[PDB]
């Protein structure tokens with residue numbers, strides 16, 4: 096009976112520099128329209144988009160994932176937990192009418208890779224080959240995780256995406272970016288002070304601050320600090336759980352180890368469900384705007 | 390200048406209560422959590438000897454003059470992303486002016 100094998104097909108007659116030029120377009124628009132959400136920019140919400148299209152994967156029967164580019168269809172688009180991402184799509188739309196050949200998923204995922212790299216983060220290897228799949232293979236709402244839970248949930252949830260202790264602690268550090276909007280998910284505030292620069296801030300804040308529990312304007316509970324920051328119950332669960340605590344402590348002292356673990360773990364997430372032929376190109380590592388002259 | 394100048398006696402108790410716990414100002418003074426702030430002004434970021442800075446503090450390389458110094462103290466992690474200086478920051482301009490006045494005289 097077996098699940099669906101999604102075989103990766105490179106877009107007709109394209110290679111490295113075609114995709115590098117798609118990077119530079121999202122990167123140029125990232126820096127020029129950096130007024131957004133009170134000067135944070137579009138960077139954080141694009142990585143959140145590359146995660147919400149990828150985190151709909153279930154390993155048992157390989158359904159969902161980044162491949163099909165199924166965020167474009169109403170059902171996935173209007174998912175309650177997928178709130179605010181619309182602006183992330185709105186951003187990528189004028190660049191999708193500049194390159195109509197690239198797949199929706201291939202572009203969505205590329206958006207996150209280019210967002211993190213431009214935000215001075217690790218260079219993440221990226222692969223092409225995602226193909227647009229029809230409306231009936233659109234995943235149904237609720238697949239994404241729930242913020243108000245603990246250590247056991249995050250562990251068992253992430254088992255579905257084939258992520259381990261080391262990998263989920265590496266993927267959560269993307270929370271050093273942007274903020275939680277109350278209009279979108281019922282939680283308010285940033286996880287740190289540097290919202291648009293990818294650092295190991297998330298962990299340093301997790302262990303060096305004094306955290307207290309409180310209720311917000313949409314009556315959900317959250318952990319808050321005196322310095323004005325916040326952590327979700329799923330974020331504070333990383334230091335309650337003794338197995339997760341060691342990995343948080345490790346990434347706190349050495350940023351380079353975190354940077355290497357995140358790229359491995361982020362790429363894997365965006366490559367989940369995809370089965371690459373061995374006549375497929377070796378992963379592309381793109382050059383940032385700073386290295387490419389700008 | 391842009392930042393004016395305050396009371397250095399009020400800057401002494403702002404340092405003693407909000408900065409001493411990690412920094413020492415004296416010549417040849419010991420680094421504890423944070424570096425020894427002697428001759429910090431006029432000196433580039435991340436250059437006091439025998440201290441292990443986070444790569445963020447060294448690749449920022451700004452010359453500490455009392456202006457960028459006030460932009461730092463108001464929110465350290467926004468100014469130098471990834472800095473391990475575990476502080477919220479001084480949000481009032483007189484507290485900043487009172488403290489940097491003291492720091493510029495104590496760090497000479």
Ligand code: HEC
Nearest residue numbers: 407408411422423434435436437442443446472473474475
């Ligand atoms: C400990 C909990 C700290 C307190 C209190 C304050 N600072 Fe700090 N400071 C600390 C560290 C760990 C570091 C190094 C950060 C890194 O990323 O490597 C610093 C650094 C500074 C610097 C820069 C030094 C340089 O560029 O050579 C300055 C100017 C500085 N700190 C000032 C400062 C002031 C005046 C404070 C009190 C209000 C203050 N810091 C407190 C740790 C801690």
Ligand code: ZNH
Nearest residue numbers: 139140143146179242266269272273274275276279280329
């Ligand atoms: C457990 C698990 C988890 C959870 C629960 C979560 C959750 C969440 C939430 C709630 C939010 C908010 C929204 C709004 O707007 O308000 C977010 C955001 C978010 N997110 Zn995260 N996450 C997670 C994971 C994650 C990961 C894994 C990643 C990647 C990689 C991320 C990234 C993110 C980002 C970056 C953001 C930000 C955005 C902005 O700010 O714009 N994330 N997120």
